[PDB]
């Protein structure tokens, strides 16, 4: 309570001295024992959890990052360091400081749901011994515990931005003590990366209006940015940057037999150990060298098709070596369990995976289901899979290290590889505390030799403001939403409050000319003309409408909201209730293409389509004539924006897919019927699950109760992909769509019935879906059919009791 963490005395002195000197002391003149983690007054429960696996001492840069400046006093901090250097620890120690000393709540923000889920359990494991409640706000997932009874909320960008807005309407902004942002370089330009700016600017604006002692501390972290100092000034934060890295990493490119360093100085020549009797660029040979040293290798490939092709080739030579240098020495018993977990899945065991996985080889792309990739990542992380051929999708995903990383080509998707993508790939080489080094090899040809060097000698592009206006397009989505949030939320009323806000943006930090100040005024006008905001005339004062407050509470983009609002009023004038199709059309997202739709397949399902669903189609805009003009001819046309008709048919097509999906139609059947892979479907439902929740809230705030009533059941049905009967069962964590079904078909319709269940009977029911651990969960200890059965019944009782998580 008094002091949860305090640094060793005079450690700040020495480090401040060394930093102020022209050159660093050959021997650091401070007790090397002072960077021992136990001397910082850390509570015992956390000190052991850190010492649980490594984490005994701090780095030179970690001590300087805390001690140099007023970081520990409450000052905002923005620091950058290479990956796997212990960037997590700096933030963890700061969160633990403020939460226990100032008794306020912290916010941890991560880019993706998968890394957010990983972080939730990772933060739960460290802080549960000190009574620190850690839950998560991810995608469609909602915390069981109220926000008032939490300490650390782990969120994605969208959910965090929404959570901030909730706290403004309830005036409980005082609860929030600090916000931690991982990967701050995604601030510049992204599909959702811009929301991170709106979030931070909103915090900087509120704390500035109270400036007219500590407030809300912001701890941001990222990769080496050229304009990182520009970001620190924007957030009024102290800056820190280091290149320190516990495992030195070598980036190298390979031409012919020769392998080269960044400087182009040849570092090693290369002679393949084995001969793949295939014109190869020694690709199999490079992987083989790594495996023999009892390690694992990540192989990144441009297309989804190369990964499967390459995993098959690698597996084939592994086959040849076994029946004829040394062999791959894999673990067969543990590999069979992996295949069995794959076998017992809603997707089944992929044919290419069936060949390669037995020989410690696998691939990873967006074509696979989220359940297959969770298995492969876990298998690779354990060492069961030694070779993993992935795409650029994995490079930005979860934490998954390997000894050697190989990039097949600097040309991804017919275009040169982005610099940020390259740095994310080569960044996964080197496990802190296990491997001595992380090696990165970029395989190239003679024509593309100059382009390969460009990547090793490359740096991140400067961070854009993402609210820029390029001449004619004076208005922009990101700005409109940002302006809407501050007016509707009630933190900006007058015209004077508006110009105060313009100062807090990252955009005005970029000038330190004020031509963008007039753009703010344009968004306000846009909001007035479209009934989002009201104006009452020492300047005119504004206020939110019902449509304004509804749009904000729904987390919808104002540009999209206009069309959503019209579509809903039209549906409530004439609505089809005999099926679920018309409801689904309203919650079908069409802001991005989720697949390349085959129109001929579409037209065949159209004739065969029942009358009840054709009525919904006609009622929407689906013309049979346009479907015919799609099959005969591939004319996108799109000459006239009045060709949204294209979007309508794409939307109705998508709505058909979601209909079979919540009707518990197998993913393989849906694939044959429509012509899209299981990866695109799963990506679609999680997109539609989120959108369905938005439309429900939007309908609730407008008073459209009847429409809301129908919609308020589909966020859950889209998430798990179930029918109404299974809605009660899926409340259990361990129960997905398939397990919920076999339990329903056996007599367990509700949670109440599931608490009364006999354990040995559940195991038997499980046996029908086929000490062997054969059942996968999320964050799974590879449950046995016995362990899983006992956990489900115990949990069903816990949910019925509503005791704790």
Numbering used by the authors: 35 to 246, 256 to 367, 377 to 564, 575 to 599, 605 to 837, 858 to 892
Q: What does the report in the manuscript say about this coordinate set?
A:
DNA polymerase theta (Polθ) has been identified as a crucial alternative non-homologous end-joining factor in mammalian cells. Polθ is distinct among human DNA polymerases, exhibiting not only a C-terminal DNA polymerase domain (Seki et al., 2003, Shima et al., 2003, Yousefzadeh and Wood, 2013) but also an N-terminal domain exhibiting similarity and motifs typical of superfamily 2 (SF2) helicases (Singleton et al., 2007), separated by a long and lesser-conserved central domain of unknown function (Seki et al., 2003, Shima et al., 2003, Yousefzadeh and Wood, 2013) (Singleton et al., 2007). The Polθ helicase domain (Polθ-HLD) is a member of the SF2 helicases, most closely related to the Ski2/Hel308 family of helicases, which are involved in the ATP-dependent 3′-5′ unwinding of lagging strands on replication forks (Tafel et al., 2011, Buttner et al., 2007, Guy and Bolt, 2005), thought to facilitate replication restart at stalled or damaged forks. Like its archaeal homologs, Polθ-HLD comprises five subdomains including the two core helicase domains and three additional, closely associated globular domains.
In the apo crystals, 32 additional residues can be seen at the N terminus. Analysis of the asymmetric unit of the apo crystals reveals four forming a tetrameric clover-shaped molecule with D2 symmetry. Each subunit in the potential tetramer contacts all three of its neighbors, with the interface between chains AC and BD in the apo crystals being slightly more extensive (850-Å2 interface area) and hydrophobic than the interface linking chains AD and BC (600-Å2 interface area), as calculated by the program PISA. The interfaces are almost entirely composed of contacts from the inserted regions of domain 4, explaining why the quaternary structure is not generally conserved across the Hel308 family (archaeal Hel308/Hjm proteins were reported to be monomeric). Furthermore, the fact that the D1 and D2 domains are not constrained by symmetry contacts suggests they would be free to move relative to each other as is required for the helicase mechanism.
